[PDB]
Amino acid sequence: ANLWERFCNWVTSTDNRLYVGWFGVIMIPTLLAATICFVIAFIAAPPVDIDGIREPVSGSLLYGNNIITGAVVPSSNAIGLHFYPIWEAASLDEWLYNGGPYQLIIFHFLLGASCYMGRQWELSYRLGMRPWICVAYSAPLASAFAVFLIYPIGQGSFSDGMPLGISGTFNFMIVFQAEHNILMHPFHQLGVAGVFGGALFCAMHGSLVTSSLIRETTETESANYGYKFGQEEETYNIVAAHGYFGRLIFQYASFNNSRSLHFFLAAWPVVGVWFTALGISTMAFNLNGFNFNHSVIDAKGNVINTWADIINRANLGMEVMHERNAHNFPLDLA
Amino acid sequence: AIFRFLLFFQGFHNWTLNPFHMMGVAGVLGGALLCAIHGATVENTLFQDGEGASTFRAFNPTQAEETYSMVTANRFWSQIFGIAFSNKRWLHFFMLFVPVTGLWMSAIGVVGLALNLRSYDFISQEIRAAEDPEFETFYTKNLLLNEGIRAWMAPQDQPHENFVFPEEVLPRGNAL
Amino acid sequence: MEVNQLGLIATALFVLVPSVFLIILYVQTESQQ
């Protein structure tokens, strides 16, 4: 009944409506700080000189944006990768002009999200579960690290991190393609397959289980009332589902082990999104998508264009226009 | 060729700005989320139904019993995320619903683009930016990107039109 | 910003009309139980 032991029992209690835990001790303050600053900035922050060229970009609602165009703007290119907390600025006005809020938000968020992953391990341990849900979450978490931390590190500037906004995200995407040809990179191709395939299998599994629900209600009520929370018996006939799907393709292309099936459902999108996070993370070091520009030439040496060369034309257009005032020299090396 | 189709749709239709595509994005990424989170949850709330360290062997397709604990899965997610599924039927229907609905929404948006009925612009942004050369958003930044794409890919991408764009008319920022 | 004026009425009814429908259905369910 010691005072520290009583605190410890409350932090790790499985009776709290929301589990706190030791990871939560860090997660709760960092997420609140990031959230509060983000909301305030999104509504009211003044324009930010993201590219360090004294050309401020207006990101907030009160400065003429709507929900789709608004953003918390990345910090000034003049700052690069330098740490820029509030107490390094001569004034909040300076700190706002240079994009200080973006740094505060992304650092608090990445910390709080990392602790979110730890919290998933921790409660699983307090409830006597198996531990690997947090491993599923490492795929979206790694993706957030890639566009908020890793890519700025390799390019030398948080000004090239992804903006906290909807149109800013598309800006990040378009510029990424012009400089890395991400579409032609196999790890992004694997990410598409993980995301397309994940949507596919989500719909498959949902439709197969729904298709084989055991009749338990009348036509005047939701079939959902045929399941009661915590009932011991399964609510659908997996052998009927297997019998349908195995005939739709062929027998051995259909699961009849539910554990194997759900593991497959877990693994496919998780691994696909690991690869696409790794794609951003390695294009951060400028190992770019396949280049087949002028790869086909004829007997004389005329270039014979392919669809890759058409892609390059579009990429060139994005290259020459992006940050139209920020380049003084012919090569955009970062 | 499909990659070229994506980029065409950015530069000419401003398709990323279209709310029907955004609803499709949410359905595809929401579906992939649901797929991963559901698979992982089942696999980490399994009942111990055998002694082997490989837990796959401890399932039998004709068993009546649920192979994982809905009650423990619900408690976990309620305490982790605030809310959780409690109805196995709703959950699997929702997994049908989310990606199917998303794809249907994107199809509606492409039907609009058949007619060049784009959500290309916000009129209020354009009126302000035309009058006020210090007003800049990520929205105006992206349209400049779209204009580069069009002028630079169109001659080779639409060869039947015989577009000849002399160097001096091509939009370009400084140096690049 | 020179926004469409009817945007406000359109937005308000878009929220209000279907939300009110759901609230009506929910409250009369509760008074059955």
């Binding site: 409506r17 929301l18 509504i43 609602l61 009160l62 709507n66 929900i67 009661k228 929370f229 915590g230 009932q231 | 009650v71 619900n74 309620s78 605030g82 809310i83 959780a84 409690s86 | 910003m1 926004v3 945007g7 406000l8 937005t11 308000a12 929220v15």
Partner: peptide, 30 residues
């Protein structure tokens, strides 16, 4: 009026979060 509208809708969603978590219908076993 459009800033007010965006913020209003956003605030309603946060309030809905609160009720959906703390005033959910409690899951009851079997």
């Amino acid at each position: 009026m459009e800033t007010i509208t965006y913020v209003f809708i956003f605030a309603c969603i946060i309030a809905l979060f609160f009720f959906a978590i703390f005033f959910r219908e409690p899951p009851r076993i079997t």
